Amino acid sequence: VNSFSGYLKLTDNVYIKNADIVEEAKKVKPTVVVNAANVYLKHGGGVAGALNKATNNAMQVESDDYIATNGPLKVGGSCVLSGHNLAKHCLHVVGPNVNKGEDIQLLKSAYENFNQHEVLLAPLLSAGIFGADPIHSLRVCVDTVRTNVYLAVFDKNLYDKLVSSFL
Numbered sequence: 001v002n003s004f005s006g007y008l009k010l011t012d013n014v015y016i017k018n019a020d021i022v023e024e025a026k027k028v029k030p031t032v033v034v035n036a037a038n039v040y041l042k043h044g045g046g047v048a049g050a051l052n053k054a055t056n057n058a059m060q061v062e063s064d065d066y067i068a069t070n071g072p073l074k075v076g077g078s079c080v081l082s083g084h085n086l087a088k089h090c091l092h093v094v095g096p097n098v099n100k101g102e103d104i105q106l107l108k109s110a111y112e113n114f115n116q117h118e119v120l121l122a123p124l125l126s127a128g129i130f131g132a133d134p135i136h137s138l139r140v141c142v143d144t145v146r147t148n149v150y151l152a153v154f155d156k157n158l159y160d161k162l163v164s165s166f167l
């Protein structure tokens, strides 16, 4: 039993809700919140900009030190950093950005990072400003993640479309 509330169950391990991931993280304080990161950990907009703003820019400060030490992530890769006031940990995961021409096949590799964590609060990878089809992202999530994932979808209209079209 966990503290996530109001989710629709899609499969044995995947759950979904129309919610603002920032507000959801502040309420649940999950062990792991997933950020929709880029390779530079520049949290300017989308989910990343919102999560970073909620940390009063502490996420960005920590991220800049991480990059200065380690260099950029790979597309499809991840790193574990602090969750600040939102979660114990933040798993920064880089899905391919279609608006940069990146290979959508890397979306499966991106979701594989979730399997290293027993329970996660997450957005749909490569959705929103990353330009992929969210219906496809949900399909890849369900077919790749085996651990327990609670998906927050900000847009109510999109949430209803994801549920109604789910196979």
Ligand SMILES: CC[C@@H](Nc1ncnc2[nH]c3cc(F)ccc3c12)c1nccs1
Pocket: 019, 020, 021, 022, 036, 045, 046, 047, 049, 050, 123, 124, 125, 126, 127, 128, 129, 134, 152, 153, 154, 155, 158
């Ligand atoms: C992963 C893509 C998804 N983004 C989000 N998902 C869950 N929670 C979110 N909170 C936010 C707060 C913000 F300021 C900006 C963006 C988001 C956001 C979207 N898919 C379609 C349209 S936006």
